[PDB]
Design a protein around this nucleic acid. Structure first.
Ligand SMILES: [Mg+2]
Ligand SMILES: [Mg+2]
Ligand SMILES: [Mg+2]
Ligand SMILES: [Mg+2]
Ligand SMILES: [Mg+2]
Ligand SMILES: [Mg+2]
Ligand SMILES: [Mg+2]
Ligand SMILES: [Mg+2]
Ligand SMILES: [Mg+2]
Ligand SMILES: [Mg+2]
Ligand SMILES: [Mg+2]
Ligand SMILES: [Mg+2]
Ligand SMILES: [Mg+2]
Ligand SMILES: [Mg+2]
Ligand SMILES: [Mg+2]
Ligand SMILES: [Mg+2]
Ligand SMILES: [Mg+2]
Ligand SMILES: [Mg+2]
Ligand SMILES: [Mg+2]
Ligand SMILES: [Mg+2]
Ligand SMILES: [Mg+2]
Ligand SMILES: [Mg+2]
Ligand SMILES: [Mg+2]
Ligand SMILES: [Mg+2]
Ligand SMILES: [Mg+2]
Ligand SMILES: [Mg+2]
Ligand SMILES: [Mg+2]
Ligand SMILES: [Mg+2]
Ligand SMILES: [Mg+2]
Ligand SMILES: [Mg+2]
Ligand SMILES: [Mg+2]
Ligand SMILES: [Mg+2]
Ligand SMILES: [Mg+2]
Ligand SMILES: [Mg+2]
Ligand SMILES: [Mg+2]
Ligand SMILES: [Mg+2]
Ligand SMILES: [Zn+2]
Lengths: 103, 201, 119, 156, 65
RNA sequence: GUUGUCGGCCAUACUAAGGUGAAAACACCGGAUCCCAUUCGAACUCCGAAGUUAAGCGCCUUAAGGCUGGGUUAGUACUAAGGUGGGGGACCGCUUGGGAAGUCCCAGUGUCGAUAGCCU
RNA sequence: CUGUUAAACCAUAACGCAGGCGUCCUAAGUGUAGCUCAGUGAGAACGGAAAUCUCACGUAGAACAAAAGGGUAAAAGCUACAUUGAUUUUGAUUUUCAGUAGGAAUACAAACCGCGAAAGCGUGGCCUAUCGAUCCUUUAACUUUACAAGUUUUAAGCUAGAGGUGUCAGAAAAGUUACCACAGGGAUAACUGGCUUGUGGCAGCCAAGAGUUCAUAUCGACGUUGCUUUUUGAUCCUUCGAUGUCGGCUCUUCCUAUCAUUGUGAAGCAGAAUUCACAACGUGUCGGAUUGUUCACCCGCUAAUAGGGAACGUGAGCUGGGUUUAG
RNA sequence: UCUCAGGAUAGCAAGAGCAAGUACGCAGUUUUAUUAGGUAAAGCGAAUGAUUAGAGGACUCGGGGUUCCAAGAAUCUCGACCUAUUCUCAAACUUUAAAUUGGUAAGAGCCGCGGAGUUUACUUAAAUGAACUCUCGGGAAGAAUGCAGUGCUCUUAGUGGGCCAUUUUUGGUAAGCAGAACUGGCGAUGAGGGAUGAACCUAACGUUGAGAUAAGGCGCCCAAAUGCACGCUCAUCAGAUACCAC
């Protein structure tokens, strides 16, 4: 799929349509200190082998993309989900119109 | 060996034609429906003898070719090829199947083709001159014996393979109302555009 | 008549004589009284329930019945469904329509004979 | 049935009627609808939006709301031996007015008229309609056509 | 194992057993499926209509306006 | 009687080869400076007024094709309820109800409008 | 998920038919404008069956990502241009339905926009498939909390996306047992019996032909009507708190689709031998090689060395070679 | 639902209650009014798909053989294109199109572009519309038939392997096989009849007498006709009847 890096859309803070930089979403790491990590560790200490289950059977070949939009005007951030895709290419509107002209 | 005809006799199915839903349905052993002098004019062979299936059943194509070949040899030898037009009215459209571990799914491959016949459907038709009517009636009867159960033999008062009664046919002869194509006759109505009728030539 | 199409094989209907009607109401007469099943004996009853309609008497009943006058409906509902007897004549064949020598259908005029057998 | 989807088994129900291909049908565009009217609901295949579920095609509902492009209608569905009210919203396309009330009003007005006049004259008029009634006695003077049962003949 | 997959046999009769229940015709019906435009109108036209009896303090509000 | 404009129904309106054409309209028609337009002023756009019913278009013509409606088809095929009905069966038929479709026949061939007009 | 089975509302089974889904698309979404496609006839250098250019005719026979069905002609198709409505709030409705969830889609009310003169149309793909909870993590947005008081840093929250469970209402999970075990199951296999009879076996009908001549002495192709339950298969009714599951030996009785013997009819019957048929089991139908064998094959005698049934007759009658515990 | 011998969950069932049991109400019924539908059939000289027969054809699209003489013309053979036809068909074809059947209705909560009101981003150029209120005018009750089953609460048992018949049906050669549809039934159910026997025929059960029956019978076993009249039948293999034993 081809997603334009620049896009005009709604901004809540600006209450109008803004130019937003469009980037893909990135899952960031698990902070060592979240209650979850804490418990996992604490259970797992001592004996009782492994505690929580481990997920062996994974069926999906595709991951739903999260578009991150940043408003140029107000700096605000918003996430939208997109349909399943195997490939994602982001492109400058410049190169997009250039490629459309060539074709 | 081929399964006994008594298996497929009764039409228990809904009709299974050779279709784009049917792969590898074989052919039917009866390929030719006309024998004798096919070139004859309605005038040349006036009388018709029909085999009419009295029963409701499925006749195997193989059975058809059988009864046919038979009737043909009979007629050709005993009168002359010149003297009879033999036509097989019925065609074998229906495909039989045969299921060849256990019952897991029974849907069968294609066994052979059969013609689905209902009570009163004409199986065979022969057209001939008077002197030969009997002979025809004879050979047809014999072909009836190549056949499942009951079928009967009949003489039509219509003209050859035409829809006209010999009387209508004769009147329309007299009045020059008849046009001739082979086994077919055309009748002329008042509904036609005058650019056709012979007179404006 | 349309509502009888469905029951034809389970029942015989016909066109009764006034005589028949009377006979029925004298021998088999019973009345629907505040839900009770009450033998037709006095006329006080016909007055009780139907009096105001102008039915004072068994004979009157029989009249609105045979004429089918202004109030048929109440004249009828007044009359308890008739519990009959075994026919003295056997029925002919109950599988067959009166037309085939059977019993189910309208025996147009003939219902009377049947009633006579049952009374 | 292995598949259940909004349009399953919709083939001949929704196909446009013969020679209806691409009919716009401006009349439906102009029909006026009011909160209390009775609507009959009929799908057209060219217009995909506001399509009712096939079950409701040819049903008669009672109007309930009026939206800009669509009439809210009310129908009922028997489910497990009970009736369940269903609030449908149909785009204008798949809706037409039912004559079931029109007949009623026309009839009523005429009837009422008759009764009022009769009330003027002391004659009580009744509007009750009686079904087919047993035929009155008749005299018949006509030409007799005497038929006899035909012999059997075979036409081949 | 072997079973009978789907039969609808006894279910129809079962359904007719106690009758088919039909809901009650209520003069006043719920507001589902009715647009807000119309609804606000109703609210307003009711609040202002004197021929429609309101509560006491309500009429105070209406009569002040 | 007839016309343009916007129409509801969408062949009884369509298709083919013809006849005919008051008036007014509609058109074909003349011309590319201007708004507009294309490879091309063909078209689209603009400006007109030397011609013309030859086109389009109205109205009619065809033992015309099509379409529309009735007739036959036929109480046929199919079908509702009953059957300790018949038949080895396939199937057929008895009693009480509904009831079709093609060949072939005969008729019809656009209708309803609002608006401004022509026929003094 | 589509079309059929499915029997004109809906609904309806089978390891029933024919197929399709875990993707693809910044345009293949959205809008405006113009254009009319598939194909056919006639015509123009190189030019040839097929390149481009023309005209006339073209109800749609073409095209519309993907399977099918439906839908579409001044368009939903083709061309060109513009734009992100594949957006912000909620809630409702329809399909399946426990009328829970989830998936889809629809109609509203508030917005903020895009295209067009404008009406209008846009909350994704013409419509019907293309999808995922609790806990946990991560992210976005918010004068939520850390409970003596504060400031930090850090940590908890509320609303909503994404990370996934395809056994798709969503457990973290490899084999072997003939050394075996328990609860049960005739809801279910292995033997008999039952229904069926395809397959096996045994009979007919028609008569092309074979019989040097001649269809039917004797046979019978192409077709076709049956019978039988000594084959095999199919089904799963009875028996799983057990009906002892191969064969032979022994013995008795029944069948006749008769091998021999009796009396006959028929012949392509000279005799001899043989073949076909009828009344017919009354009596008989043997000795050994090899094989656990049923069967098979051989060596022999014989009037003949018929085919079968009786829980595939016959284990409180044997035998135990085979089959199927533990070496 | 790791769910298939089980659980929940609706449905079916019992008891206790609530409410004015809107009777202008209700209905596994008709009637009447308005309406849906693409199945059966039929249809393929009508679309889609198959698919036999012969003929014609000014104009045709090519092949081959013929002939001549010569390369052309004349001409036999093929098909393709029309011409007028013709044989037999479709569950995944269809113009046409049933029976049986589905919606919604048949009035006091009715009808009538008559009135007066109410509406602060409801509608319109428009007192235009719309929705609700109070008014004005008219309205024998607006089909038959039946009501010894009015509606609703609450609490809860059992059940969740089914099986058979008529008709319709799919797989299968077929099966006392395996699956589905409507109504029953058998299970849960006795009585008389089919000698006999779950699902057939009559018929549904408190204790008991009478009478007249249904289904089926009346030569004997056996209650009741060796009744009274017809037609047909002689078997050295008679025949003797629904579901049924071929
Ligand atoms: Mg009797
Ligand atoms: Mg019965
Ligand atoms: Mg339709
Ligand atoms: Mg109920
Ligand atoms: Mg017609
Ligand atoms: Mg017919
Ligand atoms: Mg279901
Ligand atoms: Mg697949
Ligand atoms: Mg456009
Ligand atoms: Mg489902
Ligand atoms: Mg909008
Ligand atoms: Mg998730
Ligand atoms: Mg065999
Ligand atoms: Mg043979
Ligand atoms: Mg067994
Ligand atoms: Mg024992
Ligand atoms: Mg024993
Ligand atoms: Mg013998
Ligand atoms: Mg022999
Ligand atoms: Mg030995
Ligand atoms: Mg044994
Ligand atoms: Mg061992
Ligand atoms: Mg158990
Ligand atoms: Mg429960
Ligand atoms: Mg109670
Ligand atoms: Mg009443
Ligand atoms: Mg009904
Ligand atoms: Mg209709
Ligand atoms: Mg019947
Ligand atoms: Mg079964
Ligand atoms: Mg039935
Ligand atoms: Mg019944
Ligand atoms: Mg039980
Ligand atoms: Mg019983
Ligand atoms: Mg007694
Ligand atoms: Mg006697
Ligand atoms: Zn912003």
């Amino acid at each position: 799929v081809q997603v334009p890096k620049t896009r005009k859309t709604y901004c809540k803070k600006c209450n109008s349509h803004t130019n937003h930089k469009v980037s893909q979403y990135k899952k960031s790491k698990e902070s060592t200190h979240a209650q979850g990590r804490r418990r996992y560790d604490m259970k797992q200490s001592g004996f009782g082998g492994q505690t929580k289950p481990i997920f062996r059977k994974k069926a999906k070949t595709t991951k739903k993309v999260a578009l991150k939009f940043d408003c140029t005007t107000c700096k605000t951030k918003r996430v939208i989900p997109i349909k399943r895709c195997k490939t994602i290419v982001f492109m400058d509107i410049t190169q997009i119109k250039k490629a459309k002209v060539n074709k | 060996g081929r399964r006994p005809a008594r298996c497929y006799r009764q039409p228990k199915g809904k009709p299974y034609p050779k279709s784009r839903y049917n792969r590898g349905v074989p052919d039917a052993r009866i390929r030719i429906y006309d024998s004798g002098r096919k070139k004859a004019t309605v005038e040349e062979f006036p009388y018709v003898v029909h085999i009419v299936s009295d029963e409701k059943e499925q006749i195997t194509s193989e059975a058809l070719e059988a009864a046919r070949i038979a009737a043909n040899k009979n007629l050709i030898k005993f009168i002359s090829k010149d003297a009879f037009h033999l036509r097989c009215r019925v065609h074998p459209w229906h495909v039989l199947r045969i299921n060849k571990s256990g019952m897991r799914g029974a849907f069968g491959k294609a066994l052979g083709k059969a013609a689905r016949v209902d009570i009163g459907s004409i199986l065979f038709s022969v057209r001939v001159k008077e002197p030969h009517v009997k002979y025809a009636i004879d050979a047809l009867t014999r072909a009836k014996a190549k056949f499942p159960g009951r079928q009967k033999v009949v003489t039509s008062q219509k003209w050859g393979f035409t829809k006209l009664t010999r009387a209508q046919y004769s009147r329309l002869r007299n009045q020059k109302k008849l046009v001739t194509d082979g086994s077919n006759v055309k009748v002329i109505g008042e509904r036609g555009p005058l650019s056709r009728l012979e007179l404006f030539r | 008549l349309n509502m009888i199409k469905r029951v034809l094989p389970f029942i015989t209907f016909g066109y009764p004589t006034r005589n028949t009607i009377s006979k029925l109401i004298y021998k088999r007469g019973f009345a629907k009284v505040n839900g009770q099943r009450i033998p037709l004996t006095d006329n006080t009853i016909v007055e009780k329930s139907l009096g105001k309609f102008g039915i004072t008497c068994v004979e009157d009943l029989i009249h609105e019945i045979t004429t089918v006058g202004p109030h048929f409906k109440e004249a009828n509902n007044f009359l308890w469904p008739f519990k009959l007897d075994t026919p003295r004549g056997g029925f002919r064949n109950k599988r067959h329509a009166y037309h085939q020598g059977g019993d189910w259908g309208n025996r147009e005029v003939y219902i009377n004979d049947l009633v006579k057998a049952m009374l | 049935t292995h598949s259940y989807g909004y349009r399953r088994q919709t083939r001949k129900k929704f196909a446009k009627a013969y020679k209806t291909k691409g009919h716009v049908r401006i009349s439906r565009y102009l029909t006026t609808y009011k909160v209390g009217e009775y609507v009959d609901i009929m799908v057209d295949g060219s217009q995909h939006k506001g399509m009712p579920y096939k079950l409701y095609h040819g049903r008669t509902g009672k109007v309930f709301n009026v939206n800009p492009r669509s009439i809210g209608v009310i129908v009922h569905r028997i489910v497990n031996g009970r009736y369940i009210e269903k609030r449908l919203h149909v785009k204008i396309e798949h809706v037409r007015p039912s004559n079931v009330k029109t007949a009623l009003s026309k009839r009523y007005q005429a009837n009422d008229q008759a009764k009022a006049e009769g009330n003027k004259a002391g004659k009580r008029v009744s509007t009750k309609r009686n079904p087919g009634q047993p035929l009155e006695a008749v005299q018949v003077q006509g030409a007799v056509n005497f038929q006899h049962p035909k012999v059997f003949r075979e036409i081949f | 194992a072997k079973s009978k997959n789907s039969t609808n046999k006894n279910q129809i009769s079962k359904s007719h057993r106690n009758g088919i229940k039909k809901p009650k015709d209520h003069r006043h019906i719920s507001t589902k499926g009715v647009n807000p435009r119309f609804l606000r109108n109703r609210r307003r036209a009711i609040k202002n209509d004197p021929s429609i009896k309101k509560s006491k303090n309500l009429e105070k509000k209406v009569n002040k306006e």
